[PDB]
Amino acid sequence: MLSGLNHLTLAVSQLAPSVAFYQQLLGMTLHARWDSGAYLSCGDLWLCLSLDPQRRVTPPEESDYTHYAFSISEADFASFAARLEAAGVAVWKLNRSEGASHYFLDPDGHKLELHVGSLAQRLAACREQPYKGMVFF
Amino acid sequence: MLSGLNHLTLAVSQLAPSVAFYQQLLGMTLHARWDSGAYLSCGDLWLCLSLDPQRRVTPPEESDYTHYAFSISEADFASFAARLEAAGVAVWKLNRSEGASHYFLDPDGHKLELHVGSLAQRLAACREQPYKGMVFF
Numbered sequence A, B: 001m002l003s004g005l006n007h008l009t010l011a012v013s014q015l016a017p018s019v020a021f022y023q024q025l026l027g028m029t030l031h032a033r034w035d036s037g038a039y040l041s042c043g044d045l046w047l048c049l050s051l052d053p054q055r056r057v058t059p060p061e062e063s064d065y066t067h068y069a070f071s072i073s074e075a076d077f078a079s080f081a082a083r084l085e086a087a088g089v090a091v092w093k094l095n096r097s098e099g100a101s102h103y104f105l106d107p108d109g110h111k112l113e114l115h116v117g118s119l120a121q122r123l124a125a126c127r128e129q130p131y132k133g134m135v136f137f
């Protein structure tokens, strides 16, 4: 039986700028780094950054919709998003199709998101404003 | 302040086989489905499958090391790996690290892993046998 996400591993092209992005800019906790990677946590999430010569800096129009959303409180959401904007962090999406979200890119173009709300809250919102053809189980 | 992973969204080329893989083969709970996606849970993980015509069925040699690991107990690991093997699910890597790991591909080539063990367990092993250049914080 699978019980959740054990870890998220992101391939990165340049380790130090990626560590700085996740630790300094996003505020995650850095636990260890080595010549080819780093381990961070964000709450319960174990994030691994893995130096990969295959990773390319990818513009958002070249990648699919696969993305990683991080939880933030309603009280903190807007000022965190505005700080990322003021820091020049690139974006990839503007239309809020899944609630209160801010869509931004990491240095390699990994698609990230700040989101306010749980799955239960999103299901409740969708009952009122459902996506086309939506069925609830 | 970011408090954890809010959700993981995977772009999928065909919704029905992806729902079958995550719900039926991998045992995740299907909460909702609409014409262009689905919401599932796996423990605390909120997973979204998003139908995306830009998703390519991608051979593992053509994607980088970015991957998504799910937690499973040691006791359940071998029978779950055998289930994936019976279903013909391809493996993209052999395990050479601490903690059991099974590295397998989803229908679109998303790189997945079953892993036994926490960040704390990994850090303890690393303290005893540090990787090249390893620093702790």
Ligand SMILES: CCNC(=O)CSc1nnc(C(C)C)o1
Pocket (backbone or CB within 6 Å): A071, A116, A117, A118, A119, A120, B005, B006, B007, B041, B042, B043, B044, B045, B046
């Ligand atoms: C399947 C259950 N997992 C999730 O809903 C992850 S997002 C999530 N979980 N708690 C929260 C807070 C905003 C209350 O947000």
Ligand SMILES: [Mn+2]
Pocket (backbone or CB within 6 Å): A067, A069, A098, A113, B007, B009
């Ligand atoms: Mn999202």
Ligand SMILES: [Mn+2]
Pocket (backbone or CB within 6 Å): A007, A009, B067, B069, B113, B115
């Ligand atoms: Mn892994």
